Design an enzyme around this catalytic site. Structure first.
Site, PDB file in Angstrom:
ATOM      1  N   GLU A  72       0.850  -1.209   0.000  1.00 34.79           N
ATOM      2  CA  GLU A  72       0.000   0.000   0.000  1.00 34.79           C
ATOM      3  C   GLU A  72       0.882   1.255   0.000  1.00 34.79           C
ATOM      4  O   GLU A  72       0.409   2.336  -0.477  1.00 34.79           O
ATOM      5  CB  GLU A  72      -0.945   0.013   1.196  1.00 34.79           C
ATOM      6  CG  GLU A  72      -2.001  -1.085   1.164  1.00 34.79           C
ATOM      7  CD  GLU A  72      -3.034  -0.945   0.053  1.00 34.79           C
ATOM      8  OE1 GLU A  72      -3.214   0.175  -0.482  1.00 34.79           O
ATOM      9  OE2 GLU A  72      -3.471  -1.981  -0.433  1.00 34.79           O
ATOM     10  N   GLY A  73       2.016   1.218   0.659  1.00 35.46           N
ATOM     11  CA  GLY A  73       2.793   2.418   0.992  1.00 35.46           C
ATOM     12  C   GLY A  73       2.106   3.182   2.132  1.00 35.46           C
ATOM     13  O   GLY A  73       1.057   2.737   2.640  1.00 35.46           O
TER      14      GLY A  73
END
Length: 158
Positions: free
Chosen positions: A19-20
């Site tokens: 996702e970051g």
């Protein structure tokens, strides 16, 4: 057989990695306000521009987000499943959604004991709809190959 498995620490670390992290709200490419580890809803309410959260809040929201996906994978699996197989199936379902996973070839192959086949079929999910046309996403191809590595080899991203 019904599942009561949980996402492992390593499995949550992998979803975080895919996702970051942003601590300030941003508008994604589709125009949706997003924050934390790809969160777009907090306690049933949309993310708003201008919001700032801590890394602890981001983990809290991701845990709340993934809960229904853990539940759905538990219900879809009909055979004994290793922690890394469960982690990989939850990571992929979290991206493609519950209905897509439920009707997938990969989950049929997992339930038939065809692990190699499941890892192959997992990686079919690399298309995104752009201007009404299905387009191969290189980002999704990368995520799919890393989720297949978790599923088959218990090798998690770094």
């Amino acid at each position: 057989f019904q599942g009561h498995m949980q996402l492992s620490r390593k499995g949550l670390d992998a979803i975080k990695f895919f996702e970051g992290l942003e601590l300030e709200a941003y508008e994604d490419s589709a125009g949706i306000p997003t924050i934390g580890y790809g969160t777009i809803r907090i306690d049933g309410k949309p993310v708003k521009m201008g919001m700032k959260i801590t890394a602890e809040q981001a983990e809290q929201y991701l845990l709340a987000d993934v809960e229904k996906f853990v539940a759905a994978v538990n219900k879809a699996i009909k055979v004994p499943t290793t922690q890394n197989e469960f982690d990989a199936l939850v990571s992929e379902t979290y991206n493609i959604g519950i209905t897509a996973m439920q009707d997938s070839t990969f989950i049929k192959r997992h339930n038939a004991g065809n692990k190699v086949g499941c890892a192959e079929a997992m990686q079919w999910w690399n298309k995104v709809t752009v201007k009404g046309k299905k387009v191969t996403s290189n980002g999704l191809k990368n995520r799919r190959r890393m989720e297949a590595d978790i599923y088959l080899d218990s090798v998690y991203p770094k």
